[PDB]
Amino acid sequence: XXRX
Amino acid sequence: VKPNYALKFTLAGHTKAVSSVKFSPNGEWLASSSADKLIKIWGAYDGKFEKTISGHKLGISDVAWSSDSNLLVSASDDKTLKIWDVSSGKCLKTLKGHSNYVFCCNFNPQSNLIVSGSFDESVRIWDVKTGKCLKTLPAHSDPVSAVHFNRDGSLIVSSSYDGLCRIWDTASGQCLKTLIDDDNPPVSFVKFSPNGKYILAATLDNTLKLWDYSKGKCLKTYTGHKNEKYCIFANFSVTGGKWIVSGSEDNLVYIWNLQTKEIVQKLQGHTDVVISTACHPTENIIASAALENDKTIKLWKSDC
Known part of the structure; x- marks a missing residue:
């Protein structure tokens, strides 16, 4: 990974 | 008056891209998470790989330390x-307990509880002993980019792509304040300040804003870094000088004068975007991690  | 940060160590061992890095409160270790489903631990001083932690089924988006540096x-x-x-x-x-990915996590100061942001747009609270989910807040109309407690652990700020910053009551579950005030950019990070009275917010308009939430208004705003796509951690630097420290999508680490709002120094040598930064509790060290075209955590020391 989501966040990446 | 201005810090000089020196690259000291570059560390790799991470297969897929890195998501977060946070320093342990004892100023010994650095923990890191990555799309490789793993948590790797590094000597904060020596820069040396300590151990792998794994057994997650999918990519870890975030990680944070407990206060007793147990957990x-x-x-x-x-x-x-x-x-x-x-x-x-x-x-x-x-x-x-989540509909979807779990994006963000932080322990409470007292460290018996955990707050968790999720792509199901809930902020949930968790008892560290039993392990059961205490309360669940339908915080936003949108996925949660951050969650944090305040100095005492009474308050939980959270941010979201919907543009909102909601501050919550830890014991009740009630939303207390909300930070809106025109704009309406997506908000990719927040943490309360150490003195707790101001809360910091990252936005996808390439902005960084500080807020006095009691008064419900922005004080100062910092620019020049590129933040559009990624939700990129934002730090307070309390140690030598008093700074704002953030990653960037132009591959630089940005440091602003907290008062004068313009940039004191930027760090290079990162071959990709910077998703996460962290400051040492005791000495002056920035750690930074970058996405898959880099896969490295760089370590930085200064005299101020």
Whole structure:
């Protein structure tokens, strides 16, 4: 990974 | 008056891209999470790889330390959070309860509880002993980019792509304040300040804003870094000088004068975007991690  | 940061160590061992890096409160270790489903631990001083922590089913988006520097909490794409006894390296409890990915996690100061942001747009609260989910807040109309407590642990700020910053009452579950005030950019990070009275917010308009929430208004704003796509951590630097420290999508680490709002120094040598930064509790060290065209955590020391 989501966040990446 | 201005810090000089020197690259000291570059560390790699991470297969897929890195998501977060946070320093342990004892100023010894650095913990890191990555799309490789793993948590790797590095000597903060020596820069040396210490151990792998794994057993998550999917990519870990975030991780944070407990206060007693006993434990790690990791939020993953697998719908779950894990609580790791960092000494052994083994998972204690696994916390289940989300519709979707778990994006962000932080321990409360007192460290008996955990707050978790999720792509199901809930902020949930978790008892570190039992492991059961205490309360669940339908915080936003949108996925949660961050969650944090305040100095005492009474308050939980959270941010979201919907543009909102909601501050919550830890014991009740009630939303107390909301930070809106024109704009309406997506908000990719928040943490309360150490003195707790101001809360910091990252936005996808390439902005960084500080807020006095009691008064419900922005004070100062910092620019020049590129933040459009990624939700990129934002730090307070309390140690030598008093700074704002953030990653950037132009591959630089940005440091602003907290008062004068313009940039004191930027760090290079990162071959990709910077998703996460962290400051040492005691000495002056920035750690930074970058996305898959880099896969390295760089370590930086200064005299101020």
